[PDB]
Design a protein around this ligand. Structure first.
Ligand SMILES: COc1oc([C@H]2C/C(=C/C(C)=C/c3ccc([N+](=O)[O-])cc3)CO2)c(C)c(=O)c1C
Ligand code: SF4
Lengths: 353, 95, 180, 427, 117, 166, 160
């Protein structure tokens, strides 16, 4: 926060409240839109019911979720059973402020974001660990080892790719040299779209975000189709709703961070509108991701672990070494454009054999 | 200065744990608390003497990571087939 | 870990109980427990006339049922010496292979969904839906059709059956090639 | 730049063990350690410092001793696990870094780097070996916490974490005490000695050889850097010697008795700490290392898991050279003329009296005279009647090594004016 | 760098998120039929013993977590070089490369041994 | 609190529970494949709100007895019903479940109202997917209090609310 | 300062009391994570910023997570089995627990210190040239130590 102002604390509290309730509405309507887009994918059509376009169905879902006999299962830990959903929701809500939705004042006067910490990516990493925390804690608390093993699967796999997230996020820092997202986005305004320099690491970031229950390991797991997952299967009225809510908020926050960090956080080269381009890129990644949601299988978390550990992370640290050589000797930055273009051509042309 | 007194108090608390705790895991947790009390004192004295105690505490965290890894591997090796990790069940070696 | 992969849960289609004797992520050995659908065909059929039992036969294998109808029919035809008209035989092989396509569709859709992806369940099922219409054309029923008889089949094919069959037979090869 | 040799050999062999048989990795470790020892020889009198890494007489002497013990104990180890060799290399480097630095935090890193493999090397899988490993690990982590809060309070007394700082009053004393706790723990000083008998008794004999040579050498090498006040030194010496010898009287097992003996000898060595001579102490520890490595190589030829006192007996009839060497070693560990144990004892006692601490010195001497009870129950026992005892009379490797060690003990006892003139800069 | 005001704004962010989550918990818990049953409170799966009596879970998760702690320490050490990189020149670059090669050798060992175990 | 005691809120929560009916499948026999077919891309019960399908019983309100209920499965399914949150409904699908069906013997429960409280009965063999849509709409208006039987009575919103569990 | 300082110290001390008194291993580790959060906040208040972020990331995110992984693999929550209770040591330890504090308090009591240095926040921007440089030797030693730690644990468990 070298150059960025500070709104009063009451504005911070107000905007946080706005972000929380907007994330409610957002995840409800995104569940609707994902249903309908899946429908378009699998021929069938969606709920032209309670809406018309479905836009009163989240209300029915929320009203059903409450009054649903929120039960505390016996043979379960009285404390963690209740405490884990709150953890999973709290440590999911936050870490959305830093994503810049415009230049300062483009919130009709004050601030597009909430907080602009000096060290942002570390804050994101730290609160991202805590989602796995709530997952496996809730698994333990339920008193059902069928969910315990699912929680252990979740935590192991997510933790492997969560380590990989660090080797992914190293690459652009060497270039910019700042850990505040606004400086990084402004760098992406100057030279342009950081992934152009670091496309390989970009990949291993993107794929890493897929491991966080987004889809295609899909061995989080969910109770369905396999050794049942954790953090569910024992929660009835709101705590399950809180798990679904926090997991989807993590989904959409990650799908928004992917363009924010590597690609063009809003900051478009032309037409420079504050919010709309960020929202459209969020929707772009969401639509590609839903394509993936419909179109691909599971990974069984054995090949997933082997792939993350042996394949993603050595490759990411190799790219880190290359970029660190380039930055420390600082000779051009264009060499990185050339190398990333060649790397993408390799990782693409090797497909059509 | 209150922070360094608190570091000493946490050192004492980890000591009370290590003495009182029956299982290896809780003893090791108390030791982690002791090491972090030391880290707090190092951060204070780095604020007083110029920031080298911060990198010192960083290396301390690394040390804790290495010894946590090794201690948990050893614990598994001894008490995987064995019953409760309680060390009072191991009294073969006496003076 | 002698884990109780119970009847119908989790997603053991075709209610079946499993005691997976298993430590870890490997599989030592699975001990099965079945009978959770025992309804009594071998016994109830001893109290139903041969004509009636054609109502009990398809419902055992509810996916590929005309094989059950055909097995029962043929065995009784041999036992009392019945004559298959050529047209009845051709129709019986039509319904046999078509119910086989439907059973196969359901099998692969269930296999893909059971672990992995959800989408290809629908497309195959789409075709299955079309097939059912064909059956509803001649038998008036989706499945569990009581159409076959000891001598042959109940009554004749409608005028509208064959063109729909040609339509589905022309669209299908590309569809199966797509699945593969 | 011998540390470069150690790092290179360790890191290369770490992967090469996947392509090389344990025997090939063993021979490679032997070559690497021998080359590091030779590099130490060619660098005698060539001080070399880069950062906190500072090579002085202590560094050279004690790292030479540690490499000697490592080479010896590798000579005995033939297990089909390359890991059981790699750790040795690792421990070596670690102990090297312990003696070659003045930075307190780098001292902590070296303590961890040398202590981690030593926990695991004692796992012949015997349940008592695991009991010893757990006792060792927990008490060592406690001592690491103590040492760390001592380094923190040291930084509280001065702007640097390097020893040689002027130092304040009570806070500096407290910091130095909290450093001395862990360092003497590594050096088997009482009242921190409880781990030593259990660990020496539970672990396989060659591992205890490696311990009783290199651990004690490196621990005193790190101790000399500390400016320990004489009163705490008197407390440690008195408690160590008294309890060590007394409780060693009542012991029935060879390894446990010898661990108590090592406690008493660490109490004796701590007398040079009155003057911090580092010449006399280098010589003393050279003799003690040689003798104890010899004895434990023989004990390994007798029994890895545990050796009773009767097992030592009749060895001369079994092996002449081994019995002679064990007798000589027992007398040198008693510090008797004309053996080098007597020169080391005399040099430490001279430094202590020169500092003017009289009651402590006399008490150490009276208790060392008391020690003849078991020192003689061991040294002379070589000639007794062999009772039932498993006995594997070794290869020629260890026999020649034992012979050289004993000959050198007696030679440095007779004529110390050969090497002792060169334990300082090394003319 | 960044002012401390953003950090109290962070604390308020957390307090607001926590307060709204506790509010959602209150809404869920207070609104309900409240008819407990013995079988309802039973864990799962048809009579007893969904998993029931099983031996301790596989250690592979311990291996993964330990791997993660050591390599996350690695990443924490790599970050100060990530920010202050050009100021360290080829000397700092070469030092960080050696560090990375050492821990990558540790990975290479654990991989050539592999953990399917 | 049972979704009652307010002229507006009981209508609101009945609206919510009725439209957001989340089925808990218990696939047993050939009725259950006609239950699956009610979700494919020709005739899908994926519109009224039943898109998602909570396999766990702790999360779903509608349990559909879909197939012949063999006696060795009676108690398990019982507990599956007891493993449901209290605001739960049960539809009896098919002839084998509603009555004994054609299998009138020692192996089948001759009316599943024995083990579970049934909301709606739906005949057919198997009842056409469209009859299943009609039954879920029947239950929709039943839990709003918009259901009357042949005898002139309005039916309670939730069956399994009138039974002294034990 | 003191307004929130008292709160942070009370949370730290109460969390320590929890982690050393409670018999539930899970509750103890959880209280230790609450402790680390309070302590990273105190670090932040001490102008040590980067270290607090690593404290939350590494300690809470990684170490105690593995603690929880093992104790959930090996239940171990009901520790009081195979007691040999040794009741007298519970109050006696408190004595020693007081003692190991008192002498420390003596070293720090009557001690005034210069807590005045413009650290400008403990950012890694300034910690880099220290780490690679004056501390590079310790860094390389730490990295090799971590490699040795991996090898030790791997050769240690290695069922075969
Ligand atoms: C699987 O095949 C089969 O099943 C059954 C039972 C089990 C069953 C499960 C699920 C998971 C349905 C389901 C499908 C799709 C969704 N969805 O949301 O898309 C939801 C739920 C339905 O009938 C029987 C009896 C069978 O004999 C065969 C061959
Ligand atoms: S009513 Fe007919 S379709 Fe349904 S389970 Fe019974 S036999 Fe099968």
């Amino acid at each position: 926060t070298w150059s960025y102002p500070v709104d009063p604390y009451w504005m911070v509290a107000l905007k946080a409240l706005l972000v929380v309730v907007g994330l409610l509405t957002a995840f409800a309507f995104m569940t609707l839109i994902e249903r309908r887009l899946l429908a378009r994918f699998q021929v069938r059509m969606g709920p032209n019911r309670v809406g018309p376009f479905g836009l009163l169905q989240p209300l029915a879902d929320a009203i059903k979720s409450i009054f649903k006999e929120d039960i505390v299962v016996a043979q379960a830990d009285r404390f963690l059973f209740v405490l884990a959903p709150l953890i999973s929701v709290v440590f999911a809500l936050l870490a959305f402020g830093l994503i810049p939705f415009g230049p300062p004042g483009s919130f009709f006067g004050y601030q597009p974001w909430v907080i602009n910490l000096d060290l942002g990516i570390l804050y994101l990493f730290a609160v991202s660990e805590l989602a796995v925390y709530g997952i496996f804690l809730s698994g333990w608390a339920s008193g059902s080892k069928y969910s315990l093993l699912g929680s252990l699967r979740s935590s192991a796999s997510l933790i492997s790719y969560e380590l990989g997230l660090g080797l992914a996020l190293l690459a652009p820092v060497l270039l910019v040299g700042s850990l505040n997202l606004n400086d990084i986005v402004n760098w992406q305004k100057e030279h342009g779209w950081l992934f152009l320099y670091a496309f390989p690491a970009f990949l291993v970031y993107l794929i890493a975000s897929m491991a966080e229950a987004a889809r295609t390991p899909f061995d989080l797991p969910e109770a369905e189709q396999e050794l049942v997952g954790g953090y569910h299967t024992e929660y009835s009225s709101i705590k399950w709703a809180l798990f679904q809510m926090a997991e989807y908020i993590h989904f959409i926050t990650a799908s928004a961070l992917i363009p924010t960090l590597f690609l063009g956080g809003w900051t478009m080269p032309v037409l420079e509108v504050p919010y709309l381009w960020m929202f459209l890129k969020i929707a772009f990644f969401l639509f590609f991701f839903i394509w993936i949601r419909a179109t691909w299988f599971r990974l069984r978390y054995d090949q997933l672990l082997r792939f993350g550990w042996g394949f993603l992370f050595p490759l990411a640290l190799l790219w880190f070494l290359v970029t660190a050589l380039v930055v420390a000797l600082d000779l051009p930055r264009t060499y990185l454009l050339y190398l990333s273009a060649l790397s993408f051509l390799v990782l693409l042309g090797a497909v059509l054999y | 200065m209150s922070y360094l007194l608190t570091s000493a108090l946490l050192f004492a608390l980890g000591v009370y744990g290590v003495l009182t705790r029956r299982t290896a895991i809780l003893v090791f947790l108390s030791i982690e608390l002791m090491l972090n009390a030391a880290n707090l004192s190092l951060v204070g004295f780095a604020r007083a003497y110029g920031l080298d105690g911060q990198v010192a505490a960083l290396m301390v965290i690394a040390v804790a990571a290495a010894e946590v890894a090794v201690g948990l591997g050893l614990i598994v090796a001894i008490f995987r087939h064995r019953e409760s990790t309680a060390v009072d069940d191991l009294s073969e070696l006496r003076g | 870990m002698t884990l109780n992969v119970g009847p119908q849960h989790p997603s053991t289609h075709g209610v079946l109980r499993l005691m997976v004797t298993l430590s870890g992520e490997e599989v030592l050995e699975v001990v099965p427990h079945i009978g959770y659908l025992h309804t009594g065909f071998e016994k109830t059929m001893e109290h139903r006339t041969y004509l009636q039992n054609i109502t009990y036969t398809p419902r055992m294998d509810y996916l590929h049922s005309f094989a059950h109808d055909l097995a029962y029919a043929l065995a009784v035809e041999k036992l009392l010496g019945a004559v298959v008209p050529p047209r009845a035989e051709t129709i019986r092989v039509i319904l046999n292979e078509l119910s086989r396509l439907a059973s196969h569709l359901v099998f692969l859709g269930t296999g893909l969904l059971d672990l992995g992806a959800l989408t290809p369940f629908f497309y195959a099922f789409r075709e299955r839906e079309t097939i059912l219409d064909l059956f509803e054309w001649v038998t008036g029923q989706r499945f569990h059709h009581n159409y076959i008889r000891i001598g042959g089949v109940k009554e004749d094919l409608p005028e509208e059956f064959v063109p729909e069959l040609k339509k589905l037979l022309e669209v299908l090869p590309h569809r199966i090639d797509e699945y593969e | 730049m011998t540390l470069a040799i150690l790092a290179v050999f360790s890191v290369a062999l770490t992967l090469l063990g996947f392509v090389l048989p344990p025997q090939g990795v063993k021979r490679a470790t032997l070559l690497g350690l021998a080359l590091a020892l030779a590099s130490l020889l060619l660098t005698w009198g060539k001080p070399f410092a880069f950062g906190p890494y500072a090579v002085d007489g202590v560094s050279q002497v004690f790292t030479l001793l540690a490499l000697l013990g490592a080479l010896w104990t590798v000579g005995l180890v033939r297990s089909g696990r390359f890991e059981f060799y790699l750790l040795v290399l690792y421990a070596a480097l670690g102990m090297h870094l312990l003696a070659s630095t003045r930075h307190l935090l780098l001292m902590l890193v070296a303590l961890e780097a040398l202590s981690l493999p030593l926990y695991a090397l004692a796992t012949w899988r015997r349940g008592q070996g695991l009991e010893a490993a757990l006792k060792y690990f927990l008490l060592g982590a406690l001592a690491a916490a103590f040492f760390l809060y001592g380094a923190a309070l040291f930084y509280g007394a001065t702007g640097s974490l390097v020893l040689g700082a002027p130092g304040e009053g009570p806070l500096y004393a407290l910091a130095l005490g909290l450093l001395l706790v862990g360092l003497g723990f590594k050096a088997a000083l009482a009242p921190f000695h409880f781990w030593t008998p259990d660990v020496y008794q539970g672990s396989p004999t060659p591992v205890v050889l490696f311990m009783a040579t290199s651990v004690k050498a490196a621990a005193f090498a790190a101790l000399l850097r500390v400016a320990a006040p004489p009163e705490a030194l008197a407390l440690l010496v008195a408690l160590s010697v008294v309890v060590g010898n007394l409780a060693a009287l009542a012991q029935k097992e060879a390894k446990r008795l010898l661990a108590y003996s090592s406690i008493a000898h660490a109490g004796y060595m701590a007398l040079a700490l009155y003057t911090g001579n580092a010449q006399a102490l280098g010589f003393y520890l050279l003799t003690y290392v040689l003798a104890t490595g010899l004895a434990f190589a023989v004990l390994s030829q007798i029994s890895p898991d545990r050796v009773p006192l009767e097992a030592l007996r009749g060895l001369y009839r079994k092996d002449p050279l081994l019995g002679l060497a064990f007798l000589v070693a027992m007398l040198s560990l008693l510090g008797l003329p004309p053996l080098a144990g007597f020169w080391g004892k005399y040099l430490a006692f001279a430094e202590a009296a020169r500092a003017g601490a009289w009651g402590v010195l006399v008490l150490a001497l009276v208790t060392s005279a008391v020690s003849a009870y078991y020192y003689l129950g061991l040294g002379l026992a070589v000639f007794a009647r062999p009772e039932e005892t498993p006995f594997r009379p070794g290869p020629p490797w260890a026999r020649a090594a034992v012979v050289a060690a004993g000959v050198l003990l007696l030679a440095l006892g007779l004529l110390p004016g050969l090497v002792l003139p060169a334990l300082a800069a090394g003319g | 760098m960044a002012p401390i005001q953003e950090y109290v704004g962070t604390l308020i962010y957390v307090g607001v998120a926590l307060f709204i989550g506790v509010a959602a918990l209150l809404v869920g818990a207070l609104l309900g039929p409240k008819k407990p049953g013995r079988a309802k409170l039973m864990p799962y799966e048809s009579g007893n013993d969904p998993a029931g009596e099983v031996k301790r879970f596989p250690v592979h998760f311990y291996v993964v977590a330990m791997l993660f702690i050591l390599f996350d320490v690695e990443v924490a050490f790599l970050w100060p070089y990530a920010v202050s990189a050009g100021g360290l020149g080829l000397y700092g670059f070469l030092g960080v490369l050696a560090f990375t090669l050492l821990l990558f050798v540790g990975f290479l060992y654990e991989w050539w041994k592999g953990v399917m175990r | 609190r049972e979704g009652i005691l307010f002229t507006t809120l009981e209508k609101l929560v009945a609206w919510g529970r009725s439209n957001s009916l989340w089925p808990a499948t218990f696939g047993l026999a050939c009725c259950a494949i006609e239950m699956m077919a009610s979700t494919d891309a020709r005739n899908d019960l994926a519109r009224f709100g039943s898109e998602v399908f909570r396999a766990s019983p702790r999360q779903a309100d509608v349990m559909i007895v879909a197939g012949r209920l063999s006696k060795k499965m009676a108690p398990v399914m019982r507990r599956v019903w007891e493993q449901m949150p209290d605001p739960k409904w049960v539809i009896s699908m098919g002839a084998c479940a509603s009555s004994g069906g054609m299998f009138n013997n020692y192996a089948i429960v001759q009316n599943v109202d024995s083990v579970v409280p049934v909301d709606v009965y739906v005949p057919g063999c198997p009842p056409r997917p469209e009859a299943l849509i009609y039954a879920v709409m029947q239950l929709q208006k039943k839990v709003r209090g918009q259901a009357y039987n042949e005898r002139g009575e309005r039916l309670p919103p939730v069956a399994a609310w009138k039974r002294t569990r034990g | 300062m003191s307004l929130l300082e008292g709160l942070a110290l009370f949370l730290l001390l109460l969390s320590g009391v929890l982690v050393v008194t409670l018999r539930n291993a899970i509750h103890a580790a959880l209280a230790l994570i609450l402790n680390f959060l309070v302590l990273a906040g105190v670090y932040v208040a001490l102008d040590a910023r980067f270290l607090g972020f690593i404290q939350v990331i590494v300690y809470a995110g990684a170490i105690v997570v593995l603690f929880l992984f093992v104790i959930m693999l090996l239940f171990a929550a009901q520790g009081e089995i195979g007691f040999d209770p040794l009741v007298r040591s519970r109050p006696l330890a408190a004595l020693l627990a007081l003692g190991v504090a008192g002498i420390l308090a003596a070293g720090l009591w009557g001690l005034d210190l210069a807590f005045t240095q413009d650290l400008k926040g403990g950012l890694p921007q300034a910690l880099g040239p220290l780490l690679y440089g004056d501390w590079l030797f310790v860094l390389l030693a730490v990295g090799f130590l971590l490699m040795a730690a991996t090898v030790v644990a791997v050769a240690l468990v290695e069922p075969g």
